[model samples]
Target chain A: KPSLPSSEGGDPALAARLQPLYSRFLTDLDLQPEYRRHESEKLMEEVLKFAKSTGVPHDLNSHSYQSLMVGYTYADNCLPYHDIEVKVYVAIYTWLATICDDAEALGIIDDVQLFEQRFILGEEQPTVLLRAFADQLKLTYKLYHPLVANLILCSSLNLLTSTSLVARKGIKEKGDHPSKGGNYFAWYIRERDGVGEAYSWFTFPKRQFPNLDIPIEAIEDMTRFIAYLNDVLSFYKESLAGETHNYINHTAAYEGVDSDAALHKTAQDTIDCARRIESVLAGKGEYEKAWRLHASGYLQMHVQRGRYRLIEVGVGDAPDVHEVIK
Target chain B: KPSLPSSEGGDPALAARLQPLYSRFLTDLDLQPEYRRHESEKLMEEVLKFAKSTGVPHDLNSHSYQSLMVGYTYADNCLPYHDIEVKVYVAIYTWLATICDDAEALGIIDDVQLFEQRFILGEEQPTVLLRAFADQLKLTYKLYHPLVANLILCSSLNLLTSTSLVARKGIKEKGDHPSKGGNYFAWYIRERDGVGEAYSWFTFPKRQFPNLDIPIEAIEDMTRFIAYLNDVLSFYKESLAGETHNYINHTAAYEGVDSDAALHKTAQDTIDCARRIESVLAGKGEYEKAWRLHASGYLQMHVQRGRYRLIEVGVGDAPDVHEVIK
Candidate 1:
């Protein structure tokens, strides 16, 4: 205030001064056995508002929590097969319910099952649903896993895909041409026309490959391929399973099911069915040229032929192992 | 409580519950104006820690927050740059600052700078840094801004790459060859690996390309080409920059400066230099065989030709051009 504004900046007023958040929103899931139903009912209203706005039919809503769960779930991973991640994840949750200490598992299962009922069978506000979603996440992370997997699984909130990167060694480029073995690389999706495609309303990462030897010609070819590929896959997805359903299924049974056994069983089963259905759609060959083989190989070259090996996606005790090795 | 034991396990009294995060944390420079020195210092720590841990040290500490600033300044099209994403975000304090009448673009810059100074340069806090690092990610974004610039900017956090995926489209038949169109992919840096080869580690998506067309021979050749390209660019980067430091001088200066003028100037100079560098690299003799050329028309046959353009990186006023249009 005394001097003119400094080259750096000026001082702010009390309200103008940025105030850090000290007390943020706390967890809404406080489980008191007696008040569980009552509290969940209150939360249900907020969930319903979110659902209706997102285009979910209120008639299909059981506990509005299911719709909210789907709303945020798909909000997280709008990618196609990436959503297939739910199946293996749920299977792990179910498997964990069978093995984790009886009480904890049973409680989670019950809560999860309640959620599934609210979501699928048109029930509402069952504690089981909430606990089940949690149990599912727990099952996904139950082991001495790779630090990469843990970090990744936590971030995307799933464990189907591996994250172990394999960096190449000894890139001594002292001559005319540069070396090929510098810091290694990793990949996520390997879509054949990953460069350009009208993939629904959601945006996706663009085409990536080792950057060294790229020619404008190759990129142009890639562009066309990706555009066409996007169409084919879009046809499959839209015709059979748009990504919207995936978002719903992934979180449908997760709300309010932290410690309910019945919830866990119902959610796990429903989730399994969802997975099977997606798999079936993917296998459909009605629109074969959409995902042309060369397009796929080109995509694979980007995702699978890099310096690092990404962890595999899918359910099982061991992480899925694929090409290029993690 | 009925059939199961306690919460965690055999000694179940621990009340084993898998708690979900009720909220999230932020370590943004944009929020500095609203905090005390401690809070400002904490924000810096959060940003830096995330940059390193998420494998994006270059952008955050690349001597500046250019990447972060660019990401936020844009209307859309950013996420693919980093695997960890430092996840640029905002909160009430800073949000309020930006929202206030004439709070910005005036002679006044305000408390945010002081906070940034305390946090990033002065007494950097480590706690915030550690937490952001704990939940961050990296990405596989690249821009062919120019062919001559031989810089191989690497991802700082766990990333995705070529060898890391199998299929990102429909599930191909077991005996079916990997699809060609779907084989197109992008690469990123992911978890650390101890491989002797840069391309040694990677995992593909769950399924192979629908029926890929890149012959085994071409794939092998392409792999060789990519490896070579990586080394060449990496060499120039290491030599001219020495552990990526030479050009980083300007990058660093731009980081702590709060003035919009300084930022604009810095971004311009850096980009200008990049263009010059790219032009030279493309004319090199070794590149003749290393890269594919669409102009020859042979490349046009295999690769759909297109030229993706960008308004330019680091522009506060960069228009929303289809930068990746090919």
Candidate 2:
């Protein structure tokens, strides 16, 4: 797995305060030691092997590979129930999503063609990855109820096409703008990545402990937080690669702030979100149940650790304070 | 043409003031005196024939027929350059858009399949309307510059798939929501019907008289005004038919107001939009040139007249003022 950045080196006190919450979070899941290692190795091998079979050069150094691995970990930490089979499915799903995303960006496919092949009926896909996806879909049909599987497939394909269109608009069109719901940047996150739907699918097929009714409001907020986590951690790396989809870039364009300031604001907002989600969970009496699963795992596995990992990758040099761009 | 409702019954003074503007709009085009009438008749015949051929029950009374005729007249008034050929294309375009929207709502065609057949490499479209569309695209490719032809094809297909997705979401999800670029309702107008792009394609093949640079901003505002006019006019009829994708409905939900109040607000906003567009056109020094062709025709043909027509259809019984829905 990629070594994610940690926030501790930048704000040790914040880390100390959040540490105790992990005991109640989803990260407390204890997988068999061998099972974890075996699944992780198998997924990486399959992902890389598929890439090679398609005549595409890829490895751990490839952004798609790293993103999928990190994404799998993030999913594992966030969802309360998952067997080895679930992990394998998510791994393949994320991996395919990443490859399709790269293909679209690299101009190997256009938006209409991608949509036609993936979501549209009766179109020849004409690619190895798509056949792999066909295999994945068949597995999905066999393992889960049809409705849940259909939503997963539709949403997965939706993100591919939606994000591809946004990306094709290029860097300038991706810049910040005011909108009815919010701004262009966050809107891209919800519409393009649709991480909320992605996360929901990760757990939709699993048997719940208490089978509680998850509040729709909380679900939306949770997804937003999840997106923010990915954005805050990935900003530096994506920026380094000249990808304009980063929220930091969006904020800079929107507010006339520098990238650094945007990064700080994103971090601060994320912390505030973490605190509010805890309160929402408490109010709903789901704090120790699902909320703990969500909050603690997110804080432990992705948020705090991801922040530090970013810094270790040379991203956390700036002080952990808000800096307004003049 | 159907007798569109006139604002003369509601606000005769406003119509009197706006009358001079149409003199400068597309109504100045010297189309053959019989061409408009002949084209309308042929279009209705072919469209109805095609519908019947497809085994779908349809007539002039069908919403699709009513909408296309109204839309054809609306486009004729708003554009300055259409002759028999242009009218054929626009009429076919609008007619197809109308049917596709109806088909999606009626569940005759799903979006996934629609996109596949129209855009995919090898999938054959198995419908009469699609055959008409294919003929339209081939005509476009033959008559216009490649760039111009591509936009028309893209915009037409875009409306089909975009509107299909919105229809699939059903009534509630179609309501008010914030988005990256704008509100869901407004975004739908831009994304689904896409009158803005449609309007652009209308003049793309025209030999320029002024040959002036057309500001993209002004064009955008013009199309938006056109869409709002159509939406405001069609609200009651669509609502009566149990459809929920109306701006009036969107306003009510977005503002937490009743449908009547929302309808009033929508009307007021559209009027303000018209005035603002005039300013935008005048700034481009195209007020009496191309802008006049666009703005005046849309106002005369769609807005002012469309309002009273709605009333005649039993929608505008209340006085022409804001009515609170208690």
Candidate 3:
């Protein structure tokens, strides 16, 4: 067995604060871990092939490719029943957005910025990677309803722009204290960073639910659930690493609340939004079922991914791959 | 004197319902009409020159150019203090969006869709007009904060997609009654169609307020004010034309309320949002001043435009161009 990081144990105080959140998930939401191992592995191979076709220089062993594979795992688990093509497209989009974000973090975002400019101008992109992204985006137009496709494109663009802004000038910490409506300021940045609109809309795949009538309020709730759930689940690892750039800290600073209070509020918000979505989708058979599967899988991804350290907080243990295989 | 259309008289009952709204704007909001005739004419000439430079094919006498000039007029009044370059960019963006919307209304949206796809792929656009749009969008990335620029780009994309969706499916009328969460459905579509995010951000030009920190909640309130104000102001013309596609009718149908009730609700919502925004920015100096100017100018645009016919309903009268020229 591989040894985990020392910080993975997390703080006892933080875990206690998160207990109510775990209880709600287990008892009220009834969320359980889900994985489509065989399908996910197959999709991973297809993603690799697609990357090669796009002339992406990274191979399977590369850090960029590995990070993208993690995204694919989450997408595949959440959208287990989606068509292969849709799965591949989602994986590719995640890869493109992730790489651009990584570039920003590395302070080489000029190329990423150039890609958007050239792409808009109907001129060749600066690099092969960006060319690949541009090619994939064109196909996006034909694959889904223009509304869904446009959201996917715009959200990705927002992610890039928001990340670049953070890179150029680190998070605007000044004048963002609670006295100046910092809460809304923090949320504004988080909303763009999370790209919640794309994932929320992704819940209803265009082909399967072409005429689905899920309300925008429900979608908004789902977006909140997606954003806050990620914040709550990642809190233990983030705090252990002393990361103040995450949502909890931002909220704490902005709202003039303690970290514990911010964590509690975020957890409660996640719970509230989940319940709202359930209430809205009640009796809507496939749509309701889709939300259940997606939400559970999303939660499961956090618990299972070693980086999140959910196990250290007594949320759940990662399943043994050998045992599962047998 | 020019004879106004009979519909300009509007329905007497509708005007009566809007009386309180008018009173609130006059008394509480203290909004009055504003125009920048000399500066507007200067900006209009530059816009024409820029359009020609882009090989747009439309001359001053063309209906397309005339329509675009109306948008420029609005931009000039709303952004009287902005640099000529910023004003020109805003006007051009409006022109591109307006033409795409016009294409959709005329049931010729295939070309608009092609513009997005080809623009993404770095291929030649189908028409010189679309080519002009593509060229101008590149400049947009350089002109605003990346966050603001991305919003402008994404919102325009959204407008195109939403309009195309409506052109194809005609606004998902079924399963949208109040009993079925029709209100959310109507709002979802309206949000996209209005492209409110772009216009709200436009209130703060990048050059003037480079480091401004208005809360996103205030921006959301501003967005609602923009969307509903337009809907409320345009209701008379749309009702006269018996257009069911407008927001007022959509809200009435989805919410299972009478048009009068819907109109009143919209007006009230608009007033509430404006107040909220005002309250949030109470002490902020330039930010507050900017909002006041933009909101007043936006209202004035609706009243003064011949198309809206606010004069027919006793709201306001258009300023004579000849008198303003001196």
Candidate 4:
């Protein structure tokens, strides 16, 4: 078997230190990874059908398409709902976001400004992928409450615009930072770039819990948890790839700390947010239960997915079952 | 002359106390009302042309249309830009938002959930006012940065959805509140319903300041200031009208305080926000200057407008110049 790339000359103990941190997070929260094979199978078919109908080329055998398929698996494992229609919508959204990122990388996406202008004006999207994404957004309005749906749409727009900025301008060098407070400026950009609000709202689909009113604080805590958790879990892979553009590195630079210290702080913050959310939702039976499943399942998706290389980091037991997309 | 309606069997001293509070806010901040006659005159014509083009009835002589014309004056006075095109856009947007609120009150708007769905899917708006609003949103994307434009669109959607909810469900009675934390819940709803973010972003049009990067803290502060200032300045009018559904009353109920106490606290909070924004923008030269002008102009618009009845409460020197729309 071809060997996976190893971490470039850097802190050798980083992964080892992160492993305990990750374990403690799960242990303190008493969250375990969950997978629903039935849901996963059904979601796959629906995603493919959605792709075809939206004019997205269906190439299941291609690595790009397969990667998106695994993303659907991630969504399936993590999402609180088992409803097929909602699941399909999420899968399509996931696919669109992935394609959008890839398109940005390939320099095929138009200037970020023109994208929304055209979409809102009923003009043509610059690419087939964007067109499909626009179609998905229209469906979003039909599926969720108007407020929630608008949030999803706006968050996606923010994500794309942020992605385009990073692609075109690249991350600002350490000495070239603009804001007086590096910490918040970094966080402000990361919040939008991460599309944290969008995913945070996704935890509760309007269809699943029609009358549920999740507190704003809980939603805010969940957004922090989601963003920080992703940063912490993806650190090992990012470190191995010698990538410096990720949030961990950005936070370290902005906060005037080493990467190790930043990772630890981020993990702690994530843990605290989870606890706060759990506390906030304590008496609300079903809503409380849904978060636990969603949070645990989200972590599980990270651990189970081969792209993160968690098994090599001594975090999970499973082998790298899905081939790494890159 | 016909006499204006007076407060009915309520605290007569409320406006008296609030007058000092509002004056303190202005004195501490050193902000004064500003209006550009040329800009206001040009904006009026653009708004009239826009209304006709968008199929909004050309009714300059009608009270409703004249009220919208005064709203354009408010936008002109408060907005930092002198650019005619940007001012026109803001005027159109102001018109749309006001019309939307009016439509909701008259029970002419569609279900809140269907509004965004139809707009995004290219379906016809349920009312001419809604279609006009949608057209204005499309124009928004063209005039502002994609990120800013997206925020504007989202904020408008939130405003409409929030307005529809208030119209349909009515404000939840104190005992009927859903959230565990009354204070934050009241604030959370108020933030969305106020459309604070949209107005905050309007302070810096892309055309006027192309490359300036305003800090996120300053923007957040501006959002708070705008929302609170509106609440504070409108308190006298709302109190006089015996309206209990406004933010001041909501805060009072949620915080377990009298409305007088709530108004004072909100006034203090608003003053603090304005000072913080001033501090954040210090030494930034043009950006700092822009905020000062915007903030003072915003307060001035409230004072000058007859609808707010600030002069009746001794907050402004001028008598109600424009006829009260009501």
Ten consecutive residues with minimal summed lDDT in candidate 3 chain A?
A: A1-10
Give the clash count for each candidate: 147, 14, 0, 0
TM-scores, each model vs. reference: 0.21, 0.56, 0.83, 0.83
Better of 1 and 3 by DockQ: 3
lDDT of 4 by residue, B1-326 (tens): 11223322334587677777777766765664353445556677776776678776635334456446546765677663657777777777776676565554444546454677677667888777777778888777566777777767777877776665445342444324534443444564566678787887777777776542554446667777888988887877666654446688777776777777887888888888787777667786767777777787788777776556676667764433234343
Compose the digit string of candidate 1's lDDT tens values, residues B29-59. Answer: 1111221112333444544454455333233
| Residue B7, model 1, lDDT | 13
Task: Please write out the lDDT profile of model 4 over residues A144-214, one tens digit for every residue.
Answer: 76767776776787677656554433244432453333344455456667767677666667777554255
- lDDT: worst 10-residue window of model 2 chain B: B317-326
TM-score of chain B of each: 0.20, 0.64, 0.83, 0.85
Q: Could you give candidate 3's per-residue lDDT for residues A1-326 as a string of tens digits?
A: 11212322457887887766665654555553343434777887888788778777665345455446546766776778777787788778767765665564444577775556566666877777778777777777656666676776776677766665554423544324333433455565566677777877776766877753454447667777888988877777656654446677778886777777887788788878777677677777677777777888787777665546566677766633321211
DockQ, model 2, C-alpha based: 0.06
Residue A164 of model 1, lDDT score: 8
DockQ, all candidates in order? 0.01, 0.06, 0.33, 0.29
Give the per-residue lDDT digits (tens) of candidate 1, residues A1-326: 01110112222231121111100100111111111011333333444443344342324222122223322222222222222233233222322222221222123323322232122222343443333434333333232122212222222211111100000011111111222321111111111112121121011111211111211112223333333322321221221211211111212222322212322333343233223222322443422222222233322322221111111111001212221111
